[PDB]
Structure 1
Amino acid sequence: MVETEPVQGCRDFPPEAMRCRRHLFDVFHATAKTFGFEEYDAPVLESEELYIRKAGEEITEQMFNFITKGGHRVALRPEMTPSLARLLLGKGRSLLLPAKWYSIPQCWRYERRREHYQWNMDIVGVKSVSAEVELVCAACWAMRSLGLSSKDVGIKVNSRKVLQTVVEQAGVTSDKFAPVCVIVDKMEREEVEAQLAVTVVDAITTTLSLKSIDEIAQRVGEEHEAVKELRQFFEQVEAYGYGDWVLFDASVVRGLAYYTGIVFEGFDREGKFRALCGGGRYDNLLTTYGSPTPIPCAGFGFGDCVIVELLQEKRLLPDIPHVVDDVVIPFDESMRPHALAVLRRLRDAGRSADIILDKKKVVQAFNYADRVGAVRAVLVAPEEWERGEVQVKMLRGFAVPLDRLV
């Protein structure tokens, strides 16, 4: 007996499970098309240098890396964004901007699950908060398409620029800002104070606990960069009709080094699950990768696990049975040639159809039709075939001419 279980921390998707995944992905695709994003993809295997950021990020700590026989340092991607940037930087001046790109890559880690699929959506070449508005709306749109409401979930929103100001105004060099976000992201675990030592810590704490935009306007003015952007953001989301889905939370920073402005997280309103999705603006990434001109970017990742737990809890993942329009049933083996001709007509006309492949009695064929979720069974029998007909029976036995089956 061979080992039937999959490799450690990896999922099998037999047809039952695959229908569930495909239900989720159909939404990701449909939302992307509704929002005018273009699909792209890149190798799951990337060069390890792509992810060496040196900021203590959990995503790079837990990187599934290995050495080829030719001695190259490579890894199964922990995230997609660096791949996106490589492609963008590769295209250079030939890329029309603004660009809106999406994908649903499988991403990896070594530490629990070692893989997940992650919908990625990114807008490139847009400086204004209109990008983040669109992105946050897309995420809400996908969750609403899955049957969730603003009673079920929300998106917490913030700007890193606020904290940046404090880091700056507290005489704390620009260089160290990314380390601080990464540490402060760990707040939800108790001894984050210890990491920041390795005062300006206090001002960070107070600013995370500020419960409103007015309170941040009071801390650094109604026309700070962050205040105007957040107001603009909330206004646009309100106008698009998703006001009840979004809110301000000063504690949201995200764990990734490269976020420079607005950042956001989806969450369940019952407090039962980790972040449903996550993202932000990252206007400097392409500059760090060597771009001669700064390229504004923003985007998000939306995993395939947390969302499924949430949907299961809310009872929004009813089992989806397989279906097929027709099952064609030879009365016996001598009718197979004729049954095949009929299968051809049905498929020719855009229908999904099986033919009983094995030899079996009609009643067993009918049972089989019902097991595979057939809408209709088409019996091809000698006496009917002479009249130019088949027998049709709906499952969700009148005789029918061949021309009228479609």
Structure 2
Amino acid sequence: MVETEPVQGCRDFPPEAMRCRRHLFDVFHATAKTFGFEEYDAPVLESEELYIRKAGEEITEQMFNFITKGGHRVALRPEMTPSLARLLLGKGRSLLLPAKWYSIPQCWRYEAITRRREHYQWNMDIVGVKSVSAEVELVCAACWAMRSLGLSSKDVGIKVNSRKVLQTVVEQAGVTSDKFAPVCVIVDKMEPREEVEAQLAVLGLEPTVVDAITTTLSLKSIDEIAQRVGEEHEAVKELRQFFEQVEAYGYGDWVLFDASVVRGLAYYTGIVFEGFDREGKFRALCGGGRYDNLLTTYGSPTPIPCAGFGFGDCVIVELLQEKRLLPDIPHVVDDVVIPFDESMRPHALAVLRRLRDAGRSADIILDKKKVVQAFNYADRVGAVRAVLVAPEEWERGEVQVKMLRGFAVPLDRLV
């Protein structure tokens, strides 16, 4: 017998599981459409050179990579943002801005544990908008998706911060700019306190510079940030604008400030955010931020402002299961056409044709079955209606219909 289990760390989606995934994706698509984002896609296979950022990111550390027969370094994408940037850079001058693009790529990782190696990740990005209205819209989109799935602001929130605060603190200490990305990557690991301080020292930062970083991540309000860097610091004005705009849109209860949020990606320059459950039970539900320099690093002759997020398919489902918002969605079909016997099969097919022409989902019983077994089958597939095509009714230009006693119905009136 062949191996029935899927490849290590990968999921199968038989129909039952697929209906769940589809319920989730319906919301991602519908939210994107509500917010005016355009779908795109790109190959799961990208050049490895695309992901070499040299900041010690977990995402680059766990690349699912391999060498082609031709000898080229490729990888199954660990994330989508670089692919997006490649596409944007390809279009160059011909891309109309602003652009709002989304996708739901499967993304990949390798880990030596004998644990998940793939997930699907909703990506939403806004390109060509300098102002915080982008981040506002993005955070609202994430909340909208969660609310659409049945969650409330009692269940979840979005923690919001700006990396510009830390930038200034690190830059005031005399640390070269190139160290800033590594610092964010290290400080993201705070969620072992001694080991984080140790890694920062290896980066070449003295104890007092580490102290200033620690203190600023522990400041619990925007006013406290204001005391440290000033009320007219870019981060303060922008964070204030952000919260004012989310409040105006009606999602104020969903969002809050948290100075410890930095995210683990090298490329965020400004506002960063992540979704979380209010019970403190799960990892991040989604994550994102502004990354205004990425396209410049890729060689764009002009700077292109970008912001966006990723929203995974695994943590959200666990949360929905906990909150009892993922009831089993059973299969449905409008009609099941039942030939009384094989001599009625041709007539039954004409009926089936009609039903499908009118936009109805319909089965016909394919093998030889007795009527009552055909009826049981109809119930198993969740048919709303059984349509028995029997010789007596057929001579009267009729069929028998039963909603799941029967009724005789003219053919013309079935649809």
TM-score in terms of structure 2 length: 0.97
CA distance in 2, matches of 1:217, 1:396: 74
- The residue number in structure 1 matching 2:294 is 285
Alignment of 1:305-316 (within 5 A): 305-316=314-325
SS in 2 for 1:11: coil
SS in 1 for 2:194: coil
CA shift digits 1:68-88 (9 cap, x unpaired): 000000000000000000000
Offset, 1:283: 0.1
**Which moved further from structure 2: 180-189 or 347-356?**
180-189
CA distance in 2, matches of 1:107, 1:220: 39
Question: Any conservation in 2 of the 1:108–1:114 contact (CA below 8 Å)?
Answer: yes
SS in 2 for 1:301: strand
CA distance in 2, matches of 1:50, 1:171: 31
CA shift digits 1:350-387 (9 cap, x unpaired): 00000000001000000000000000000000000000
CA distance in 2, matches of 1:61, 1:171: 29
Shift in alpha-carbon separation, 1:194–1:90, aligned structure 2, 3 A:
same
Offset, 1:190: 4.6
CA distance in 2, matches of 1:179, 1:3: 43
Offset, 1:396: 13
Unaligned stretches of 5+ residues in structure 1: none
SS in 2 for 1:190: helix
CA distance in 2, matches of 1:360, 1:74: 53
SS in 2 for 1:55: coil
Moved over 6 A (4+): none
CA shift digits 1:315-337 (9 cap, x unpaired): 00000000000000000000000
- The residue number in structure 2 matching 1:339 is 348
Offset, 1:192: 0.4
Q: Does 1:269 align with 2:285?
A: no
CA shift digits 1:227-268 (9 cap, x unpaired): 000000000000000000000000000000000000000000
Shift in alpha-carbon separation, 1:210–1:261, aligned structure 2, 3 A:
same
Shift in alpha-carbon separation, 1:372–1:295, aligned structure 2, 3 A:
same
CA distance in 1, matches of 2:96, 2:51: 26
SS in 2 for 1:192: helix
CA shift digits 1:264-304 (9 cap, x unpaired): 00000000000000000000000000000000000000000
SS in 2 for 1:256: coil
Shift in alpha-carbon separation, 1:396–1:242, aligned structure 2, 3 A:
farther
Question: Any conservation in 2 of the 1:222–1:228 contact (CA below 8 Å)?
Answer: yes
Alignment of 1:89-168 (within 5 A): 89-111=89-111, 112-168=115-171
CA distance in 1, matches of 2:325, 2:68: 44
CA distance in 1, matches of 2:337, 2:63: 51
Shift in alpha-carbon separation, 1:265–1:44, aligned structure 2, 3 A:
same
Question: Any conservation in 2 of the 1:168–1:174 contact (CA below 8 Å)?
Answer: yes
Question: Any conservation in 2 of the 1:66–1:73 contact (CA below 8 Å)?
Answer: yes
Shift in alpha-carbon separation, 1:396–1:371, aligned structure 2, 3 A:
farther
Offset, 1:191: 1.4
CA distance in 2, matches of 1:355, 1:293: 60
SS in 2 for 1:148: coil
Q: How many aligned positions are there?
A: 406
Shift in alpha-carbon separation, 1:52–1:396, aligned structure 2, 3 A:
farther
SS in 2 for 1:2: coil
CA distance in 1, matches of 2:375, 2:188: 58
CA distance in 2, matches of 1:388, 1:363: 23
Question: Any conservation in 2 of the 1:78–1:107 contact (CA below 8 Å)?
Answer: yes
- The residue number in structure 2 matching 1:393 is 402
Question: Any conservation in 2 of the 1:156–1:247 contact (CA below 8 Å)?
Answer: yes
CA distance in 1, matches of 2:105, 2:171: 37
Question: Any conservation in 2 of the 1:277–1:302 contact (CA below 8 Å)?
Answer: yes
The percentage of counterpart residues that share the same residue type is 100
CA shift digits 1:13-44 (9 cap, x unpaired): 00000000000000000000000000000000
**Which moved further from structure 2: 61-70 or 392-401?**
392-401
CA distance in 2, matches of 1:73, 1:171: 38
**RMSD value over aligned CA atoms?**
0.8
Q: Does 1:195 align with 2:195?
A: no
Question: Any conservation in 2 of the 1:375–1:396 contact (CA below 8 Å)?
Answer: no
CA distance in 2, matches of 1:385, 1:220: 84
